[PDB]
Design a protein around this ligand. Structure first.
Ligand code: PLP
Ligand code: PLP
Lengths: 711, 62, 711
């Protein structure tokens, strides 16, 4: 932060001479001087250059063309405008947040002007930064306390060992001095939630529109366990969603509760839909209470909003129909549904305080923002118990937290306030819609097959596309209107291979082959499997990473139409088995895999293995108690009908659990077992495309074995 | 628009206002309906009753 | 002072080559070289740049466009014009004060030209400076007289102590070397009135239009006590104004005199008017002599012109109607009513010597000018005894005056002499009138409430607006025409909240909240309280300090219309009581205070309290005699009817005295006691706006105590 801009040239000498004298004075305090051209030149030095804090221009030249565009991008940006004798303000400059610093054209006083700019810049740093981060940066340059934890003490022990000097010189002197425990009085303690930590939690809740936001120092996987132990005593009933995460599985195995699983919707490509509105009714929930032994009235509900793919729900209908006093919204993928007008009334924070209820949100911080790992937030909107949830937080958080993660967790909330933060959410949406239009433009004009985006036929508007009932792009049988929305930044690429009715085709290329080609250039695919893709276009994805993805997609069509070799295209796949992948081309491998999907019939077995839920015998908590006592055995995959599994089956593809730890596969869940045996045959002929199922151990013959419970 | 010397509150309604918040309803002189009052918390752990003239009154138990 | 200007590039080589040779010669003697462009470029290098002393231009190019505009600014400014063979003067260049130094275009003679410029520059320094300041600067570089006072002797003792080096290195070496006393022979003594001090007193009185003037080195508060003890024997009668100063009250407590207080005019906003023309009559003054016990013919009259708000009177009517041989004018706020044609006949110095009378003025020097603190003057206009008035001046001035303030006291009289000083007095008026028009322009065009300037509806002139009897902006009933004047550089912002008839309204914001909002940016209101905002637009307020005030006023309307919080607007007020000012906004605080003013009725309990006067039992000199003997006691505020106070009550707001030391509150001054009890109730509910009365001590219960005398 040391860029000073000097716009325009009046051509006279009594105004340019103070500029030349100030040019030699600002360089003595480490400041970069730039000379923009016209009005459009200064506008490009703010959006692309964020390290700018000084704008020098003539007040009697552009008093309305600069005080309006800059105010739409930053509010606290200092404006070192130079006024004259006959200078005044404008009536259209009253409702604009600006910081104008007036000066004169006096000779010899250039040294006093440089001291005022440095002090004004210091005031800008101490204002935009939160009091927790500001106190951490000031403690390094002044606070030098001894006999404290940890033992390194700002990197002192590393300066006495040859191996320690290499680890200290990698980061920096300011990095080790910022890692302090609760051994500091002027910064407070995180466990006590007082002093600087008290105002830090209230600052994030005001930015993200919440009551009292929290700062988890262990990650999102831990925040879901602390909240889950609140509205679930030793013997209750919760309404957990079927599309759960690995962290949510351990929550049901550590609490003696009776969960009730829902039945979300889905199509044939593998895109996870949502829970219908019929499941949120009062007669539907009460019907499953009597059918499930040892289950009372549900006191907690877990809703995954949004899912792993990227489909939001309608909170305006759930907060009125779902009669649950503790509704959870796992917002681990949408940390931005607030700073945009096309995201109003879609999450738990948008709206008023629902009486008699409470909203929980575990928004991931180190996923689609900018902070260190093991960071999360807890958004509470309602009335909770004071002497209950406090004990649940200390059971998973150490007494000496790492303030380096806390300083970055609150920083992401500070990067959203103002026009400088609002352009990050809207900027990623404009780059996403532009990328969606480039696919349809390069599809008709091209000569042959081309990728397709799972989007409606009309993407001219700039909002969330609703999933209506008179459309054919979503492919969901009987979907509720005004309930399922589309995420613009979550671009879902559909590879040609299936039809619009849910069947197969002769010419098709699986998405697993394209995912291996993108990894060669450095593009990591988030979700892949049958005939679908997924990418993350958050605020950190600039225009370079967006345009580089389309170039990698156009190169796949050129290498496939010309019929090239695998060795001259996929060097990583060739090193796995050079003997088998010798005389094989790119067209021979793409056609042999496509015939295996039609032969084994993947879309039909996958769609029927997820709707029919297996019979849950006991609670997931009782299944873990038998494992510690030594009552587990390993059986074959073909010999398990009528047994209780011990682990959770997570086949890739897709990415949702199959059998919960504690269920039994009987005659009703027959297609469920057929889905596991089908992946073992299709993923065993060609190297590199092996079967990936979390829970199935590979032996020495090919048959996978699972861990079940003894009878 | 009347004087009062003692105000009675309900135990089932006092625990809800001091935990969840909102507004409290209490009758005057042990008669009438549970009217709304401007009761707040004090810095010295008391109960200040505010009226139409912004006057303070610390409550006490017999 | 080392700026040399070179105007007009002829394009030829025989004229530009001597310029290049002179460029390398003037830099050897520390001189800055500038190159203006056109004719308007040189004009901007004089008004804004005051460190210029050399103008080089072609005489045969602009002989009439430069010798006229420069002469209107600085007369003794050297002009290094270069003439040619066929060069001559003009008939219109005879009545102009200029200093033109001709030269030639000779090669190799650039060294001799540089010696002539340095010698000419030294002549300009030895001319614009007074002989007292010239002897002070010469004694620093050449005076080496040892064994003198003070003991530091230019900072010798500071170089031997570790703590003394920090105090000496802050100001500078030349700062302590000028701190000399009367231990110098070539500078004389101030008490002796000889040598350089004798010519300094005649130089100040000649510029300020006076016969004899001194240099008070203890502020204006001390100069008022020296003159008051010159024409007021023990047991006489003085005519002191009611709107007096803290120092004017102590003058009545040091001399056994019988004062007679006047009845100044006032409105409802708190701005005090002036003394009516009926009080200066002969039948009005003589009537109060018989009613007051122990009172003879008044021999001295103290008139506060102008007051604290800045309202000039009419000296053309007082010097003929008021029959006082010693009329005093407290000119502590107008040290400039002479250097402008819109101030003729408004002060005591303007005009001539009154036959049989004498005029005394205490023009402040450090108030609204440019000099060190504790500096004042005594302007004497008449025939007084020199051997008698000299002994009274030594009663409050030490024998070793501080020449650092004396040099700056005479400097203010030299900075205003000539056309160079008239551009600062008239320049501050033009900047003040321009600021007055920017308020009315941003009031009608705005959408909502806006600040108002206490000025007439027609301000399309550059003079003192008279307070007529057919106007409603001033709100002074029974006002005398051609007696009340307005100071254009005294802009009084009237905040909305009251009507034009003197009653109250429904929507308004008090001036006490705005006073603290301006403090965050570095703006302190000179006078605030009810609904007024007084500011000082003297010579120290340039175009930067004037335009910075308008921007802060527009930010208050934006922050109030959007309804912001107190913590996110007033951080200084939030730190006083974070618990009470937690859930409070800017609109809730602005409306609760406005209702307290209407409920307690402030304009009525303040206008009626200042109108009536308590019964003065004894003289103020007799009240101080009983305090030294120990006959004082502290009583309550509610129990004091019929007692004699010991100190002067100065409640804030406003800023004028209430009860003089030696008065009694009977049944006539009933509203006087009600004004003190009303401020004790309104200033106790909300923190920050406590009751400020210089005389009321705060206890531990809330009730204030006063200091009275024993019965
Ligand atoms: C990725 C993810 C997590 C894990 O996030 P971490 O902060 O790395 O622990 C937890 N829950 C869901 C729904 C996730 O998608
Ligand atoms: C400010 C003031 C004074 C005090 O001025 P100093 O030079 O500081 O002594 C005295 N009289 C009046 C009327 C003042 O306004």
């Amino acid at each position: 932060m040391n860029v000073i801009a000097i716009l325009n040239h009046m051509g006279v000498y009594f105004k340019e001479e103070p500029i030349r004298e100030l040019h030699r004075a600002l360089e003595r305090l480490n400041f970069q001087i730039v000379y923009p051209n016209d009005r459009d030149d200064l506008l490009k030095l703010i959006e692309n250059n964020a390290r700018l804090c000084g704008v020098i221009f003539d007040w009697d030249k552009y008093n309305l063309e600069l005080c309006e565009e800059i105010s739409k991008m930053n509010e606290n940006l200092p404006l070192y405008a130079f006024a004259n004798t006959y200078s005044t303000l404008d009536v259209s400059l009253n409702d604009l947040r600006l910081q104008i610093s007036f000066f004169e054209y006096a000779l010899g006083a250039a040294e006093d002007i440089a001291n005022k700019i440095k002090q004004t810049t210091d005031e800008y740093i101490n204002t935009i930064l939160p009091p927790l981060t500001k106190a951490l940066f000031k403690y390094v340059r002044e606070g030098k306390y001894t006999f404290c934890t940890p033992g390194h003490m700002g990197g002192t022990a590393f300066q006495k060992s040859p191996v320690g000097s290499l680890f200290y010189d990698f980061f920096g002197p300011n990095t080790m001095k910022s890692d302090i425990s609760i051994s500091v009085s002027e910064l407070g303690s995180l466990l006590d939630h007082s002093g600087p930590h008290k105002e830090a939690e209230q600052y994030i809740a005001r930015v993200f529109n919440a009551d009292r936001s929290y700062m988890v120092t262990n990650g999102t996987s831990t925040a879901n366990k602390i909240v889950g132990m609140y509205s679930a005593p030793a013997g209750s009933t919760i309404l957990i969603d079927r599309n759960c995460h690995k962290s949510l599985t351990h929550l049901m195995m550590m609490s003696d509760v009776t969960p009730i699983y829902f039945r979300p919707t889905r199509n044939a490509y593998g895109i996870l839909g949502g829970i219908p509105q019929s499941e949120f009714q009062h007669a539907t929930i009460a019907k499953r209470v009597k059918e499930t032994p040892n289950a009372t009235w549900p006191v907690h509900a877990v809703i995954t909003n949004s899912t792993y793919d990227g489909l939001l729900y309608n909170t305006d209908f759930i907060k009125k129909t779902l009669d649950v006093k503790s509704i959870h919204f796992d917002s681990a993928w949408v940390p931005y549904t607030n700073f945009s007008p096309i995201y109003e009334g879609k999450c738990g924070m948008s709206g008023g305080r629902v009486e008699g209820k409470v909203i929980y949100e575990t928004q991931s911080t180190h996923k689609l923002l900018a902070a260190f790992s093991q960071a999360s937030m807890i958004h509470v909107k309602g009335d909770v118990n004071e002497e209950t949830f406090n004990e649940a937080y200390m059971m998973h958080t150490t007494t000496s937290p790492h303030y380096g993660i806390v300083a970055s967790t609150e920083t992401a909330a500070a990067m959203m306030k103002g026009n400088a933060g609002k352009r990050l959410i809207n900027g990623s949406i404009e780059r996403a819609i532009k990328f969606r239009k480039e696919i349809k433009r390069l599809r008709t004009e091209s000569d042959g097959w081309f990728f397709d985006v799972w989007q409606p036929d009309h993407i001219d508007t700039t909002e969330c596309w609703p999933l209506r009932s008179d459309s054919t792009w979503h492919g969901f049988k009987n979907i509720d209107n005004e309930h399922m929305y589309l995420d613009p930044i979550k671009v879902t690429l559909l590879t040609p291979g299936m039809e619009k009715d849910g069947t197969m085709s002769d010419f098709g290329i699986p998405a697993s082959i394209v995912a291996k080609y993108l990894d060669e250039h450095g593009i990591v695919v988030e979700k892949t499997g049958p005939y679908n893709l997924l990418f993350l276009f958050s605020i950190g994805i600039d225009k370079t990473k967006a345009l580089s993805l389309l170039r990698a997609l156009t190169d796949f069509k050129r290498a496939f139409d010309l019929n090239l070799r695998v060795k001259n295209m996929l060097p990583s796949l060739y090193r796995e088995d050079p003997e088998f992948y010798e005389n094989m081309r790119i067209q021979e491998l793409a056609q042999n895999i496509h015939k295996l999907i039609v032969h084994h019939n993947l879309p039909d077995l996958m769609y029927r293995a997820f709707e029919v839920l297996p019979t849950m015998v006991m609670t997931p908590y009782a299944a873990f108690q038998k494992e510690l006592h030594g009552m587990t055995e390993e059986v074959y995959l073909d010999e398990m009908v009528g047994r209780i599994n011990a682990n959770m089956i997570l086949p890739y593809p897709p990415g949702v659990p199959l059998v919960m730890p504690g269920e039994m596969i009987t005659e009703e869940s027959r297609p469920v077992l057929e889905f596991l045996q089908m992946l073992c045959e299709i993923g065993a002929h060609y190297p590199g495309f092996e079967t990936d199922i979390h829970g199935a151990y590979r032996q020495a013959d090919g048959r996978y074995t699972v861990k079940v419970l003894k009878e | 628009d009347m004087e009062v010397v003692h105000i009675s509150f309900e135990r089932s309604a006092l625990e809800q206002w001091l935990s969840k918040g909102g507004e409290i309803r209490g009758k005057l002189n042990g008669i009438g309906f549970a009217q709304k009052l401007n009761l707040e918390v004090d810095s010295a752990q008391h109960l200040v009753v505010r009226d139409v003239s912004l006057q303070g009154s610390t409550l006490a138990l017999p």
